[PDB]
Amino acid sequence: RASKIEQIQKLAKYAISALNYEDLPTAKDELTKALDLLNSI
Amino acid sequence: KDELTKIMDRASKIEQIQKLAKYAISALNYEDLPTAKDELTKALDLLNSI
Amino acid sequence: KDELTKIMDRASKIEQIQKLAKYAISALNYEDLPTAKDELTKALDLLNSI
Amino acid sequence: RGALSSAILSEKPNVKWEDVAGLEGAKEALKEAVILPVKFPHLFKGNRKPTSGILLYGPPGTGKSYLAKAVATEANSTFFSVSSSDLVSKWMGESEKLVKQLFAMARENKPSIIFIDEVDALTGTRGEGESEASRRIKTELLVQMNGVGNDSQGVLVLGATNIPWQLDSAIRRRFERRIYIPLPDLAARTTMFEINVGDTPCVLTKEDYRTLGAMTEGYSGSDIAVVVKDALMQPIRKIQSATHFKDVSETRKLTPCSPGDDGAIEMSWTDIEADELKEPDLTIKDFLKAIKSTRPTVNEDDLLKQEQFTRDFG
Amino acid sequence: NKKLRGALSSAILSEKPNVKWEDVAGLEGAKEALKEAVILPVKFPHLFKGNRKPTSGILLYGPPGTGKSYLAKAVATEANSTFFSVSSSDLVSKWMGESEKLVKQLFAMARENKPSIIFIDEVDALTGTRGEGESEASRRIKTELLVQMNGVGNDSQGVLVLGATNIPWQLDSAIRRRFERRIYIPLPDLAARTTMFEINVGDTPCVLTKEDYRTLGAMTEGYSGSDIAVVVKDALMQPIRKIQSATHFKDVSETRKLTPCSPGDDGAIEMSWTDIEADELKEPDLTIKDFLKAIKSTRPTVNEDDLLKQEQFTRDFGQEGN
Amino acid sequence: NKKLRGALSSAILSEKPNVKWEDVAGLEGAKEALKEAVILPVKFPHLFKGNRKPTSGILLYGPPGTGKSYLAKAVATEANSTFFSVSSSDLVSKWMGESEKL
Amino acid sequence: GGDEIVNKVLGGXXXXXXXG
Ligand SMILES: Nc1ncnc2c1ncn2[C@@H]1O[C@H](COP(=O)(O)OP(=O)(O)O)[C@@H](O)[C@H]1O
Ligand SMILES: Nc1ncnc2c1ncn2[C@@H]1O[C@H](COP(=O)(O)OP(=O)(O)O)[C@@H](O)[C@H]1O
Ligand SMILES: Nc1ncnc2c1ncn2[C@@H]1O[C@H](COP(=O)(O)OP(=O)(O)O)[C@@H](O)[C@H]1O
Ligand code: BEF
Ligand code: BEF
Ligand SMILES: [Mg+2]
Ligand SMILES: [Mg+2]
Ligand SMILES: [Mg+2]
């Protein structure tokens, strides 16, 4: 539960960090692996 | 000027996507799934709008 | 918000009951039975309104 | 006396004539007024007398003290950079003796040049101000600026003022040359960006500098300098956003990349020693972000008051 | 010449007020700008070489009671450098010329003790746009401030001029040109208010949770940081009023740890709290009712017109401080 | 110290202009109130002991030229006490923070 | 002469330097 919610933040961070290179690919993915998981909650 | 409008316009959208993600994170810190599932979304849709 | 309205609303009534009792006491200090028998009452009725 | 050993500078700040972007008329006027009496001394005798008073004004932060630094660099002369701190004392009479010995030392050290920054600190228009420290100092400066026959060869007074309409009319008439320093145009903006970037590696081109100068509409020199400073500081912030470092090519020159790549070594940034961090390169997006961040420091009331002053005393 | 330095040596504080970066709730952009202003040129000196120079002036402005002096305390704590805290009483003198020689000696000491930080609280008192004020003090102090900030033959390199003011529009245009970083410190948002409540409550034993702190931050709509501090102070003083204006105590669970309760219980001893000696004291714990009463009692201070003036100043010449 | 007392010593009048209570016509209540509030604590100080205190300020208002300054002259005549006649020119000064000290 | 002390006046400010 708590670990799962944290793993979203961990993702959404990487995603942010990724845009800092304009890397849309990584972003659109991590921002997604994250969202799906917030629905898995 | 127009090429500048283009790079700044996309740069602005990217900043907004990152802002929404930061807000989403901040939201989970209260377990507020509602806000989260929304901002993490308004953000994603926008990364596709890019 | 609504649970807050509930706890604050009852807390507010309790404050008013205590105020009326304090006024009643203050009144007897002049032997004013009239005021007293009234405030001590407006108060009691309200503790039943709780 | 010996307390005037701080008014002269011996540092000579390296600001050449090419560093001053734009201001061609002011640059050539200062150039002839500091060079031609030293270059051709036979040209100035009798009727064709050199310029003895130069005044610079305009919006705040346009290049007045920068032009003074350029004159102090490429003048080869004694620079007297003194202000109102070294002219007023606690006693009476010493405030006049300071200006007297200042002009005496400037005449003894010919050829010299006196630069008074913010000359409105000495000209309070003597409405109801301090008498012994305002009016006597103003009359002493008026009778020591009478070197149209005394100091024909030697000293030259300067002036830099942000608010020139609050100035004494006597010293305004004594300053014969009053040059208006305006906001820089597009070519001056582009060469100012080229100077402020300098030897820093970049991918910016002449078209990129031209569209940067077209984006900076109404900006000033200090605003251009702090925009260049923000664009220089942006790769340090990108290194501070440490995620998925990646080595490029000598002796482990690391560089952060996008999250998810080939060889994305996920580590920190403070664990690596110095002189092996290949920093990212200057794009145009960090410059546009610095433009969106930094605001112009000048307003429209100062511009219309400057226009009124130059149309009243051009 | 030495009496000026002896008078100015009282402006270098050595008390070190323990305010860390985790004590400040919010203001991440202002904290990052202050970090890249002071922490970087002393920790990593191999980056600021050549045409790259650090910041040489930061103007903090906003509504009254938002945390400008708190960020100044945090910079003075975590700077590990010389901190100059001057004001209008340390520069204006009775004599003539001393009012500028003090500023010259202050900037000389700041350049002699580099890296040093000059913090001038309420810069609007010294810089009054030199249009109508007192001729001598206004003109001489403003021109000497400009000359000591950049000038020509000074070369202020390594010093930082911090400034905190509530009136940013009444500054001189040349002073606004000197301050190259206009950072707007706004009223705190919801997450900043919840973290400020979590900081200000501290290690006091309470039944409050994260949802309770979230509801408190949602309740405080438009409050400032000092207002959050005083409602925390009122809610913390509320058990003292509970132990004062109540009778019929009761020993709970320890050398008579007695607690005020309702009149009539298992041992409702009717006595006074003044007769009770120390260390047999079990005060009632904090709830959400005490903080709700503190919110209902204490009113916000900042109006809704100064916010419009600060918003106009941001849209004119200002950045954002998040 | 000496400057303020030297400037305020001129406010005390010692000429004692002879205007008696019979030189004012009418104003019976004002005459009685001023008479008690200036005469009784000076003449019989044992009547005001503890709970009873005299009047500590009297305002005499009305139309201009009705005998207000004449009544003040009568009080200054038969007061048998120190009379301070101040005005705007004796309190207001040119310097900053000098009128309050005066 | 001696020192020159700056004072303050009121208008409706200035520096009336009354020395010693
Ligand atoms: N003509 C110019 N060429 C290059 N930089 C300039 C020019 N004008 C202004 N600047 C920039 O703006 C600053 C303003 O000049 P400075 O001498 O510091 O102050 P001021 O113009 O107010 O006397 C310069 O130091 C420089 O950073
Ligand atoms: N943003 C904030 N973060 C943490 N504490 C704050 C904040 N704002 C206010 N406070 C608290 O309230 C007090 C008032 O803030 P303060 O630094 O005095 O503001 P100012 O600069 O307006 O004088 C602080 O000393 C601190 O105890
Ligand atoms: N009731 C009165 N008895 C005697 N004289 C009076 C009376 N009322 C007015 N006067 C005369 O009128 C003049 C006005 O007195 P004054 O009190 O100075 O007026 P005001 O103070 O209103 O200017 C005095 O010179 C006084 O002689
Ligand atoms: F125009 Be600058 F500030 F001298
Ligand atoms: F009251 Be604070 F200095 F904004
Ligand atoms: Mg200048
Ligand atoms: Mg403050
Ligand atoms: Mg009268």
Numbering used by the authors:
A (entry chain H): 290 to 330
B (entry chain I), C (entry chain K): 281 to 330
D (entry chain A): 116 to 364, 369 to 433
E (entry chain B): 112 to 364, 369 to 437
F (entry chain D): 112 to 213
G (entry chain G): 1 to 12, 18 to 25
Please quote the authors directly.
The large and diverse family of AAA+ ATPases (ATPases Associated with various Activities) includes multiple members that form hexamers and are believed to unfold protein substrates by translocating them through their central pore. The structures of several AAA+ ATPases have been determined by electron cryo-microscopy (cryo-EM) in the presence of engaged substrate, including the mitochondrial inner membrane protease YME1, the disaggregase Hsp104, the chaperone ClpB, the TRIP13 mitotic checkpoint regulator, the SNARE disassembly machine NSF, the VAT archaeal homolog of Cdc48/p97, the proteasome, and Vps4, which associates with the positive regulator Vta1 to drive the ESCRT pathways that mediate multiple membrane fission events in eukaryotic cells by disassembling filaments comprised of ESCRT-III subunits. Here, we show that the mechanism proposed for linear, extended polypeptides is also compatible with translocation of more complex substrates. These observations indicate that AAA+ ATPases can translocate two chains of a substrate, such as would occur in crosslinked chains or in ubiquitin conjugates, using the same mechanism as for an extended polypeptide.
The Vta1VSL domains dimerize in an antiparallel orientation through formation of a four-helix bundle. Each dimer binds to adjacent Vps4 subunits, yielding a stoichiometry of 12 Vta1 subunits (six dimers) to 6 Vps4 subunits. The Vta1VSL density is clearer than our earlier reconstructions with the extended Vps2 peptide, presumably because of its 10-fold higher concentration in the current study and consequently higher occupancy in the particles imaged. Moreover, the Vta1VSL density is better for the cFF30 structure compared to the cF30 dataset, presumably because the use of Spotiton to prepare cFF30 grids reduced the time to vitrification, which reduced the contacts with the air-water interface that cause complex dissolution and preferred orientation. In a substantial increase over our previous reconstructions using conventional blotting methods, ~17% of the particles derived from Spotiton grids contribute density to all six Vta1VSL sites on the Vps4 hexamer. Reconstruction of these particles yielded an overall resolution of 4.4 Å. This supports the conclusion that Vps4 and Vta1 associate with 6:12 stoichiometry in the fully assembled complex.
